[PDB]
Amino acid sequence: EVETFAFQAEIAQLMSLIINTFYSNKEIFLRELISNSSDALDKIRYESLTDPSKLDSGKELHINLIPNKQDRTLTIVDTGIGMTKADLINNLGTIAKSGTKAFMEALQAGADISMIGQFGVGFYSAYLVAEKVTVITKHNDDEQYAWESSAGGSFTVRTDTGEPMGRGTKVILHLKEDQTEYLEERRIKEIVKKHSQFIGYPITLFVEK
Ligand SMILES: CCNC(=O)c1noc(-c2cc(C(C)C)c(O)cc2O)c1-c1ccc(CN2CCOCC2)cc1
Ligand SMILES: [Mg+2]
């Protein structure tokens, strides 16, 4: 029921560097995830311009940020195009092998970790703040699937039994114990205002309690 896969070696190396390098500017993870959501929303919008039925799975195009201090999780939900099972296995819809090699080479030449998005592998900056990441996704052409990894060289993919999503992607960040600042409303607002001013979709920061 659950399939376990090994990361390509270059991606495992990148994840180990992200988890073990000293780097204080960890807030960039949220810019990268919101950017990915915006790109996926662009994709379903473009497909809908010639086939309106592709929005039968949901006409609203938005990004929601959902902190939960009890679970110590930050969840980012979008209603973009979503990923098929094959996309998930294929490094979450990215050419991550060649992106990670170029990025780690740039880091050798003095590049900064904040440039990770220029190399198409910004997703993995989630491991700056998260000990585990779950990605739940639904694409019009496939069933709902959950990808998960705590690094350590492997990820799992399984059919998702949770709340049906309609269409889109949910990223659940299981935060490290010393990274709970990213559950505070003021901190999230600050990061969104600083890094995501020109995202062309409504970003709703949920409140708690
Ligand atoms: C069939 C094609 N589907 C998609 O492109 C897609 N659907 O949902 C995507 C999301 C992926 C991520 C992470 C997990 C990679 C998100 O955080 C949010 C998404 O909406 C998502 C996606 C969005 C962005 C990226 C990363 N880019 C980066 C630049 O090069 C191309 C890939 C990869 C995948
Ligand atoms: Mg693009």
Task: Characterise the protein shown here.
Residues 1-209 are annotated as: Interaction with NR3C1. Belongs to the heat shock protein 90 family. It is found in: Nucleus; Cytoplasm; Melanosome; Cell membrane. There is one protein chain. The chain is α+β, with helices and mostly antiparallel strands and 209 residues long. It has one domain. It has helices spanning 9-20, 28-50, 85-89, 96-108, 185-195; strands at residues 2-6, 63-68, 73-78, 130-138, 145-149, 154-159, 168-175, 203-205. Strands 1-6-5-4-7-3-2-8 form an eight-stranded mixed beta sheet. The radius of gyration is 16 Å and the shape is globular. The relative contact order is 0.24. Residues 33, 36-37, 39-40, 43, 78, 80-83, 87, 92-94, 120, 123, 135, 137, 139, 169, 171 line the site of ligand 2GJ.
Blueprint of the fold:
Layout: E1 2-6, H1 9-20, H2 28-50, E2 63-68, E3 73-78, H3 85-89, H4 96-108, E4 130-138, E5 145-149, E6 154-159, E7 168-175, H5 185-195, E8 203-205
Parallel strand pairs: 2-8
Antiparallel strand pairs: 1-6, 2-3, 3-7, 4-5, 4-7, 5-6
Helix pairs in contact: 1-4
The structure holds the ligand CCNC(=O)c1noc(-c2cc(C(C)C)c(O)cc2O)c1-c1ccc(CN2CCOCC2)cc1 and magnesium ion (MG).
The ligand CCNC(=O)c1noc(-c2cc(C(C)C)c(O)cc2O)c1-c1ccc(CN2CCOCC2)cc1 binds near residues 78, 92 and 94.
Family: Belongs to the heat shock protein 90 family.
Protein name: Heat shock protein HSP 90-alpha
Organism: Homo sapiens
